[PDB]
Subunit: 240 residues, 6 copies
Amino acid sequence: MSELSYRRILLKLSGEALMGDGDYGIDPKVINRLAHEVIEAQQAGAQVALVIGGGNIFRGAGLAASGMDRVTGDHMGMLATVINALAMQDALEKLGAKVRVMSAIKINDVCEDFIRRRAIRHLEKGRIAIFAAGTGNPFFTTDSGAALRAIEIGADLLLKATKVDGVYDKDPKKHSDAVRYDSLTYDEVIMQGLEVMDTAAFALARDSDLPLRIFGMSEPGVLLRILHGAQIGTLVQGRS
Amino acid sequence: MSELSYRRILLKLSGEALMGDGDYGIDPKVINRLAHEVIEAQQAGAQVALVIGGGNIFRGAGLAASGMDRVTGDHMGMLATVINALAMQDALEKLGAKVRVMSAIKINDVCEDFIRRRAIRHLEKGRIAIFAAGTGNPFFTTDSGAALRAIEIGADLLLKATKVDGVYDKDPKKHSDAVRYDSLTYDEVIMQGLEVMDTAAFALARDSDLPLRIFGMSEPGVLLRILHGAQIGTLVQGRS
Amino acid sequence: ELSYRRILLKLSGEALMGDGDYGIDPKVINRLAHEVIEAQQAGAQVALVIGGGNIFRGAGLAASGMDRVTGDHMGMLATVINALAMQDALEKLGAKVRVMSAIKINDVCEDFIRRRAIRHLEKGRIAIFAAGTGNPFFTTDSGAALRAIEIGADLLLKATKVDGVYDKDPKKHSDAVRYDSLTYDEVIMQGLEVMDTAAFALARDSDLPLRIFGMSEPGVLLRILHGAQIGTLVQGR
Amino acid sequence: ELSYRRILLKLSGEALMGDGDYGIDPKVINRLAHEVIEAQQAGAQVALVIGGGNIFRGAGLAASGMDRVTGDHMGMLATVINALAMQDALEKLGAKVRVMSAIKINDVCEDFIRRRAIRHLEKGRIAIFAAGTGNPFFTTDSGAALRAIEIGADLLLKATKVDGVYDKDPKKHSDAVRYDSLTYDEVIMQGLEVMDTAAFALARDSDLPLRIFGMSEPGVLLRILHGAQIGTLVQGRS
Amino acid sequence: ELSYRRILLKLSGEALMGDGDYGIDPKVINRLAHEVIEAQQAGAQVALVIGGGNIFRGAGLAASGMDRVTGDHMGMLATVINALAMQDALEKLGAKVRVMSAIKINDVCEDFIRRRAIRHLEKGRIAIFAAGTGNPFFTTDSGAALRAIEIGADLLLKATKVDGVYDKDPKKHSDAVRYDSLTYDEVIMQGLEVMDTAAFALARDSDLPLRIFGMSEPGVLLRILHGAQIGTLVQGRS
Amino acid sequence: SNAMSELSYRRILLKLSGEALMGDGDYGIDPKVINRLAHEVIEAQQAGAQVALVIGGGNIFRGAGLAASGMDRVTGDHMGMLATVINALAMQDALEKLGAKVRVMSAIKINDVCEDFIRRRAIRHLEKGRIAIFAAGTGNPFFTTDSGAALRAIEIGADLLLKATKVDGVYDKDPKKHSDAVRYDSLTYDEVIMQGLEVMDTAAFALARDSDLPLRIFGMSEPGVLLRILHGAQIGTLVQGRS
């Protein structure tokens, strides 16, 4: 047996999640903190895939300008995720972890291209899979790419780490009586206009019935606990 | 002043030149002024190639970690260099300029691979060439990529834009009687222990008989004056 | 003059099939190519996206005990064949054609490059896109919407069996009425079917004007370009 | 135990259609998967090549006023679609497979690299080659011959409608007999049609042993591996 | 005026060596460059294929008994070096040239793409093809034929050591008879050697006109373009 | 072979000029020379060394027709890079003939012909006991074979770059012109630059200096020398360290 309720998982973060208290880039304490959480999880036996957005890098008036071409912007954003994946990889490897970064667009000798069968193979070998450049196409979000990769690797759980720990009744940072759901249907999310991922991202996850755990990673040990089946955050799953 | 003293030029800038007063990224007003200067040069009949570093993006304790794997850092810098090239391409195109971004490492639909023959014909067609990612090799400096590309395109002049306007025999910011050199031999630079460019890049430039102008972009029209033979900053040329 | 300068038209692929139960019907593709040249010759810039349902067919090819990803690839592959067929058909009529693909294949089809695709269009070349998005779990609709956004299309046209968007069920109901035009939010409220959720959000977010219609008689496309009201027009916040 | 260590089995595309007239008949492909898995289970390192005629069919696709490079390109893709189908059939029965294409198509299958292909066979993986030679104007048989030679196969098997090479048409002239064994030169002199000229020249120049046979009844493959004289064996210099 | 508008000229690599034992003789390669540019200026669209035997030679390189895939790869690489030298010589004389290879090699030589190749030819550039077919076990002649057919050449010219196809060795026998014209079928019937079997079949199945000839003296290539009957013409049926 | 206890260098890169392969001939590869070299490399590996190889292209890119005095240097560097791929292929073949596992990795992509260089993959081949053969230098014109060798050595974490030359080591003065000339056992990177000693071209030497790559300049004068160096023998000249 395994001691995990979930064996193969894709954990998705914002690029800012790396930023800590700074205004750009990566806080080393934070990334190192996160590397430890991740290695703890795989050591418990979990097969771990990581997806990290690029908003800590592709940001500011000059880079993420409203007057920049959108495709141009999305490419810059993709390139940013590659840069974050490289940093995550290094932080992990310094801890003795085995890591493979795969991008949705080919970049020679900096990382490997995503090949579904190979990704799976790295995972079945206990390597951490880090996915960059999302879908490889502009006009698609990091969530889209996370969802795509979770389905392709046959992940049992997509975890999306957010500022808010769960999908609430109604935005807690503006309402102190907001009630977080323990679990929800894909259809109940739509029915009530809850915001969870962008439309396209959510439709993709919904179409394969990807179990979707929304939560806040604002405390050490939270991941392992979730892998041991802890009902932390909100589980989105199933029809209605 | 119609006729050019220099017909095909390669201009090299640090990434932090794009940053302006900020502490990361790109200041849209700075990149606009840069674009304006480049177009001015091109409209006077110069064939212009650009190389811009990545230090405005690959920065901070978490990205340019003081103890990270060097290959990983260099790869990160290379990707930063592509992000800057895309933003340079955008600013130029908004001004009516024709531009082609070529990279030492190919990345589909974001930048073509460098091909010497195609680069040269882009210039003959009046297109501005932007080179990203250096030599494509870690352990090589942006200066090295600049010298290599200059030689490969047969540039008549390699220009390195620095904060300080030329090479000083002291250092004009923290010293009263600093003296600027007008023109120096490659050998005079070394003999006088002057710090102009890393040993490998400097040697490449030297062996290829490439005139090198170190200068500050201190006011509008400097580039154009240099193209008309003006003696701004310092010329490194010849030997002994 | 022209109501739409640059358009992308997406076909299902069985649209190539004709009365046949398989592959392609030569007479129905010549007619198809005839309409396309007509529109370009009228000064329009044309991009084509065709599905692979005519080739990716049957219990053996399209099964359900099949790895979805590999079925998706078989579909992409099958869109590249159709593209080559159309390309051949258009070129025999002296039209200039460039097939570009989400997945690159040497000396069969070009890789997709936004700036290059557009410069082909501007040069009067017909652009055929294959393999959609390049990702499994994504429809031909998504692929078409993406490319049309990428090339700054003025209109995405989507040929279907049924001309226009339903009020009821054109095929057993009798009294039905096609909406002339619609809003993206009107389609979403009334729960009408236009494209799949993902493709449709992608279109909306870029306010891609989309015309759902049926190509029956020779001229329909050309008329639409001169401005008409054939089928349904989905647009606006 | 094995009369052949490493084999390449070549099938035409229509072998897949079965009773239908395009695509793949699921029953017919399944039977094939089983025979292949039996061969590999017996200790044989197996490679396969399947043509595209079952998919690149019809007056619309495989025309005759068409560009030849185009139609060859259409056939090449069709061989990849067949390879993918065969791949999933083999995997649904517990086999390790690797699809390798003469033309690069990322994320759908591997590029053919000879050294890698061999490395695969010796892991017990079955190799499936698509897109033939990668070049137009070359036959599926040429692709099969070239790959059989590159991997150092002991046997190229070619499954066909007729269970061997005959002195005459056995569907039109009973009394026609099957050769048990011909040399390459025997074939050339008797004007016997086996493979197209180029493909046969390729095989002859490397003395590739050739088995022409039919796969009508189950166990043929295993029988051949143990040493049965099924079909016609072509090899040697006259 | 012009009897052939699009041609492919095939040479062996030794043709660039001159009297040397290896590599390239600069005087010899400069004469061939003129000879090529002369054709181009006459209005001919000219493609070139040059073998590698001037480079891939000696017991160390062309090791009679080394892995054949390996030595064919070493051969393909040699053709690329020659292509680069031919290109340099040609451009030095003011010509526009494009080297295309069956094997992609970045910033050295383009991927071969049929439509692009014709377009280059249409714009007045000389097309140099290297690396043959891209497959081991195929000859330089095979790659020449495939290329000539892919680009729609009206003539494939094979420069060889004797000026045509002969009854017997003309260097030992002043008695020898040269054939002006031969059919593809006569060549096979009389057992004359023109190209290897696979290459010959490839050219025959597209009825590619072949001119086997000696580049003995300057101007021969222009003359041929104007209808001169030099060496031997192979064409046609029965 | 020998015990892993005796290894003074675990991962090495050996660099040779292409002409080291020609032997007596004025072109290409002398079968006797290349077979000898494979034996030296196999013996190094059997002693537990992880061996990487870099051979230049001057045995093939030579003569007035190829290495033309007045020719475009870029196209001549390209021709030279292709020549190194050819030499690597021959080396692969000789080595595999003697039962070694080999991988050829090129700085320039050439599909089917050889693998593209990728650092992580190269390290993995080495730790799997395979010989790594690097071809095509840094992948860029205007860079010496020594530069490609230094870069590769640093990328794979070599404990030693060995550079085989005609002269076995670095001398205080030209030996053939100074019966007095003496051969340094070891030098610092700074002593080299200070005395104007010639070890590599400037760019290659700065790459190696900046990573402090240990450099052993030596002559492969008689068989067994490589293996002796691997067990700590003081042969040729060690360049390492600072000040």
